[PDB]
Symmetry: C3
Subunit: 624 residues, 3 copies
RNA sequence: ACAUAA
């Protein structure tokens, strides 16, 4: 057992007591909150051509005393919060796995106890790091993770639930050894850039303390890593022969500025088909996947070398240039608000729907699956249909990626949403075409549609993604040179080192999500990416302001209405019906929502004026 | 952008603005309702050995787009109306794909806006037609689709939501070029056959105008179709050799009138195993699927030739003869109503269950709006268990066929259901054996069980399925001659051209669903099929009336009861309990439902008089 | 149609009317309850290397069960009672299938009619027996199944629903010909061992009458069995060669008493890898699976010969000795009750949670609340996470095994649970490590956690699993000699003949589930297993009593609290809000649930005293 | 999933 002191917080790490059959296991306790995390990794190579890594974080509300809420008295499905926490843990540990580790791996988090004071999600990230550190699973150095808040202008490490509710910042930092950053995930109440930057360095300092404690625990209990059957990386001489075959053709494709997404992919694919058959002849004994990956390595190396050497991008832009941005509002007459935001070849359609306040309380008690209530009655739903990439896929349910992107754009817009709006605000963002940051375009399109709908948001919100291309030492691994790219394409994210999504107002930052693919990047690079994104965000907000700069003076004429209808006591039974049958039927066939307010009063919400015309007729005849 | 005028309605069709990465995309707008449809087809052939076409129609709200529901899709899946709409779109476009197009294809419909006036489902069919027409996907001519209603004796094209509520007909027609009919789907309020036939004529005329508009847009855009890597139709050389090997043996099997479903299939399989073996030595380099398909082509051709040349079906009857029909009611004492309907080797057991009127709502706004509320508190649930065909299959959840057949049978029985019935009527139809139209047997069996249960239906309802065998010009494509078959077997549906299911009373038509495998059929064939089915329906109703001709004078004595109990205000808190705890505990230990009526009255619904008795003991002791 | 008389009850068996396409089909009727069961078996061998047998028992409609709203919810619409009934039917028929019958087989039970007096579950078991008997599916001998109850001291066969509500025993017996026992499943109200043993004898006698009737129907119908194209069992001469290769190595492994679960599995695996190489060279034309099964047959035979000949087990125990047992209570401060039970290498962590009566047995929708009520407001949720065996698996939804084990451990504890407890009691058992009977460990750990939580249970409950190894000559099929093993390891269950799990207090039996893998066992063996398990149970209760012997005098001070708040009529509208919106909001942010009990008073339930503080603050400002 | 002697 090891105790780590983080200011006034205490972190207790232990292992060797519970779940001793798993490859790795750890208990991380803070206060009276304890989280057990286990890691399992198969020894037989996975048939998949990548590393299959799954992280599952289960709330298990028996640890809080509030699990059995439905008719089965048992959880059904996984909530939004569980999915989001699973993604944060996944982003914190995925970069540190060695390349070619194609082995099925599962990290599971079990909430032994929660005291309602210390949040278990941060403990779970540290638990995953300890469990992997103590296991025989090949995994690079320990990761420390903290949450940083700002309460009354003071930086607080791992704030309690009470403090998180008074905090203008919710930043989660995962650090690797030598003060590298592997994961950043923030939502802020439109705070200044300098304040945001200081919280990052305070957070990274704390993660080094956790890493020191985990290293002591690893040393105390001897850890011997397994030797995998093999690491699936292409042979060096095969890769360099691929370079001989396809360097010039790939270079020509990547310096052709007339390509669009599809034509560039087809041109690269044309070289791949010719090269691959030549590789098979030269190395008939090579793995078929080894042939495929060697081309991908060469294509990635050529692609990055052009950006590093010539400071020019595959579409002709320089490092700080945006794609073409086109906006337009008032798509359709019946929508409460709408907008179509285009950023390069990325097209996003955003819709705003006003709903009743009563429709925003879908939680554990009301339904088996949904849980929670949004603070401001505001939610964003994000969809990524298969045709946005000319692909075929299942359309039942939502991917974990769709949930994460929706959450990112939701908290990007959340700080500017007004308080005490009469209706529930639902924003739907649909990606019609995608070649880049559709989640950041969902934030820009979201604000346009919100202003078009007449919601008085405090300020317009724009987001952008910053890429990164580095040249590291082949032995030391230190970063010798790097380029930050503004508003990256899909190929620049695929071949890049991070996907640094940040959104905000012209005067502050509201959301950030750094998806780093390297095993950590220095804090200086993160600081510069934030500054570069600040310049890009101003340009985008200037374009958006031309389309619409202030919210419309009122909601659309065909918008929802809320007003009350008086029914007599003698007519209460007739109007309501047996067990509320009449109300539930009128509300089911007209779309309105009737809620009893007093003994005599019923508040009626109608999505359209026509809907209340239908409902008003029914209430009149029923009252007769 | 092309505008098509359909009477007082106007159709706007456009492309090139949204979703430009999809192989094809289109926006169809009528009034303020806009629907965007995309089509994506892979260039790599799929290993499925059939055409993997999937259609997904999705709505972002319920109740005419007034209650947002898209945020709940992760847990609350897709509604029934979405599934039914997807099947109608699928049936309108699937016959027009070329043979051997074994490429994964998906058509997705996105309701950009709905005005609560113009129905988006019809626009989605047209949108799928435009999206395929403008794409590089190999697809035959454009399809136009309209809905025809009848309001005050007037035929209305694409009626609004307000108009549809007053209509006696809900007919959807999809038409191909040259006035061919591709899909028919209707529910009618027991209307005359001639009125029904005129609506089809009116509908087909309007679909031609839509096809004219779509062709103009295609010409302006300049569409060029892809060249698929391979079309998987079997080579004529192998087919001719298969014919030489198996024609005589197949002919003997199909003229043996002693076969049942299983023995005939086994006999054909015996020839297939021997022929498929010999085909390999002759063509060792042929695709193994091509061997399978070549035998299937030959067997289908031999099967049809017998019907065309000799006017005799494979089981010996003539073109208009029904299979043997046996009916039976009141098989189990405790069921509120039951019937066992047999038609050849198709056996369906139908059950009627009375429930409380409050059981038709889900007590939660969003889910209640998602599934809707049935008009007469009447619903039909259709089950097709795997043992009905001696197969093994997943038993939880209903596939798309079960949803479609259930709605078809429910539409057939809906017009005769009385209004203001005291209880919710649930009809359950379970296919115990299948060799044919179990969905139409569900309408007949459902009609018998409703009378056996004492529901005062207006008239008995019977359904039948009409097949079709045609001989077409190989190059011209015109239908030289055809035979209409009454009450087809499964093999006749498999080898046929049409599954024309129609149901009605002795004086009218209540439902229809035409599943056409050909790329359109002439309207004369449709009219003749409707007439031929009317004769068959009369015979079935005569057999049905012998078993039971009128509903029983009252419900069964052991059926549900509804009673009123008075509790004072003083005892009200103790009776209901904390947060209605006692009411729900009683509702779970006896099954009775107690609903407050006013300050003094509680209405008790009990499935059986015994359950009412024990519940009544609970009330008095607690009071 | 054959009628079988069972005391005052009558069984009617029919076939040949419904569902004639199925391989087998039958209708079993008792009173006015009729169940139709069909059996389908493919003639093509399945790719999987075992017998795929699925039993699905479906209630067509409880009251009017109707249909789940959508497709995915339909996959969730299978009730718990349906799953448990499917498992009992599966265990009754699975042992009688021939060895090597690797053909997909589905048994489906359709409830044609239910009179609410006679129970359909036992008719379904008999229906499956008749359907298989009349079918062409090879199936060894009919089984008969009855339920035995004890009403005011009288043994009742197939008691009605009214009788079972007053019974002290719910025992279901499935018998094969010549008085063999195939399935036992019991739930007793802490009854004496001799009373329990007599009910088994009575039940076996009745099952013989049912078998007699089924045999007459089979003979009168004229059944002919199919000839499977292959029975997948290893050929004798390849098993003999495998025995020569690996007898001594396997013998040494199973007599090395230092092995643990993983160490022993690895040692056997090393022999398997070496032996399989030699087997392939000796038999190049052998089926790949035939090689695998030959080693398993040889390994199983060597394993069983040691206990038969030497009366000693692979871990050095003798036949009646338990594994090491350890217990802890009160491991986390915030849990209402907690216990960590360890038995050998099996580790189970049990948690007790209290919640309100309303929020514990009753849901919002009455239609689905049926088959979702608990008599004592008591339920046990059992989890078997994949890391408990160092495996990777999905953690979405309970499988059938987790549902069955949860119901078994709940049955074991149900009779000692007090009536009229102020709260709903939910017990969660998590199997952290698994090397044996975690379900019986869930009963003991559940007992400790219940005592630690302060629930005044009448007596402590312990469970144990009894294994069996028999010696049978193939020329006769009779059991010559046998050994009953106390507290079996996983390997003894895998290589054994039964998994006889029984639980109870120190003076009675509360639950039993015999999972027999043989095609029936004599009653004498069952009787001795019950007695042998009685001795083991007393020893376990002695160890548990040292950790905690009586329930804590009170619940933990940080447990749930219930008290009322007076709300005036004037404040009532503002307090509850429109449609109860304010109360629903409070129940969401805080775990506090407010249920009205009177026109002026509301009952407030708070899971923790801290959560009650927030609720009091919320209601005070609302009151103003 | 979809289509499928239904």
């Amino acid at each position: 057992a090891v105790a780590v002191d983080l200011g006034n917080r205490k972190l207790e790490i232990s292992s060797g007591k519970l779940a001793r059959f798993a490859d790795g296991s750890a208990v991380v306790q803070s206060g009276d909150t304890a989280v057990m995390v286990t890691a399992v990794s198969k020894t037989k190579p996975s048939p998949s051509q990548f590393m299959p890594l799954v992280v599952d974080y289960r709330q298990k509300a028996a640890a809080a005393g509030r699990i059995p809420t439905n008719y089965l008295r048992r959880e059904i499905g996984t909530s939004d919060k569980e999915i989001l926490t699973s993604r944060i843990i996944d982003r914190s540990i995925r970069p540190l796995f060695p390349a070619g580790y194609f082995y099925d791996t599962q990290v599971l988090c079990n909430l032994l106890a929660v005291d309602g004071v210390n949040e278990p999600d941060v403990l779970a990230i540290n638990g995953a790091s300890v469990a992997l550190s103590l296991s025989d699973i090949p995994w690079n150095g320990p990761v420390g993770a903290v949450r940083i808040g700002i309460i009354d202008g003071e930086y607080v490490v791992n704030p309690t639930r009470k403090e998180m509710s008074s905090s203008t910042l919710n930043l989660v930092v995962a650090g690797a050894p030598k003060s590298q950053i592997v994961m950043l995930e923030a939502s802020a109440e439109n705070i200044l850039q300098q304040d945001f930057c200081h919280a990052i360095k305070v957070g990274v300092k704390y993660t080094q303390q956790i890493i020191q404690g985990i290293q002591q625990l690893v040393k105390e209990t001897g850890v011997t890593k397994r030797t995998p059957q093999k690491l699936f990386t292409p042979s060096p001489e095969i890769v360099k022969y691929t370079h001989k075959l396809a360097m010039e053709r790939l270079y020509a494709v990547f310096t052709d500025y007339e390509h669009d997404k599809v034509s560039r992919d087809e041109a690269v694919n044309k070289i791949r088909l010719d090269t691959e058959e030549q590789l098979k002849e030269k190395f008939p004994e090579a793995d078929p996947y080894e042939i495929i990956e060697s081309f991908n390595v060469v294509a990635k190396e050529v692609f990055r070398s052009i950006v590093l050497n010539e400071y020019k991008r595959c579409d002709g832009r320089d490092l700080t240039s945006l794609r073409n941005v086109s906006c337009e509002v008032d798509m359709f007459k019946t929508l409460h608000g709408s907008a179509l935001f285009q950023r390069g070849q990325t097209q996003v359609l955003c819709t705003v729907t006003f709903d009743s306040l009563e429709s925003g309380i879908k939680s554990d008690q009301v339904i088996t699956a949904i849980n929670g209530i949004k603070d401001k009655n505001f939610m964003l739903h994000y969809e990524f249909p298969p045709y946005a990439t000319n692909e075929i896929g299942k359309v039942t349910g939502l991917n974990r990626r769709e949930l994460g992107h929706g959450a990112l754009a939701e908290k990007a817009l959340y700080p500017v949403i007004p308080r005490d709006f009469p209706f529930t605000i639902r924003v739907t963002s649909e990606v019609l075409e995608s070649n880049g940051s559709s989640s950041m375009a969902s934030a820009c399109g979201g604000s346009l549609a919100l202003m078009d709908s007449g919601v008085p948001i405090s300020s317009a919100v724009a987001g952008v993604a910053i890429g990164l291309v580095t040249k590291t030492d082949p032995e030391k691994g230190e970063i010798e040179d790097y380029r930050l790219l503004t508003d990256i394409l899909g190929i620049e994210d695929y071949n890049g080192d991070m996907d640094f999504k940040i959104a905000g107002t012209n005067k502050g930052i509201t959301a950030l999500q750094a998806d780093i693919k390297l095993p950590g990047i220095p804090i200086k690079i993160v600081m510069e990416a934030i500054q570069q994104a600040s310049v890009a965000k101003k340009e985008i907000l200037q374009i958006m302001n031309k389309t619409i700069s202030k919210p419309r003076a009122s909601r659309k004429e065909n918008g929802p209405v809320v007003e009350t209808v008086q029914v007599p006591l003698s007519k209460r039974a007739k109007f309501v019906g047996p067990g509320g049958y009449n109300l539930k039927k009128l509300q089911a066939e007209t779309g309105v929502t009737i809620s009893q307010v007093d003994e005599e009063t019923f508040s009626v919400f109608a999505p359209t004026p026509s809907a209340m015309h239908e409902a008003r007729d029914f209430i009149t005849e029923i009252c007769k």
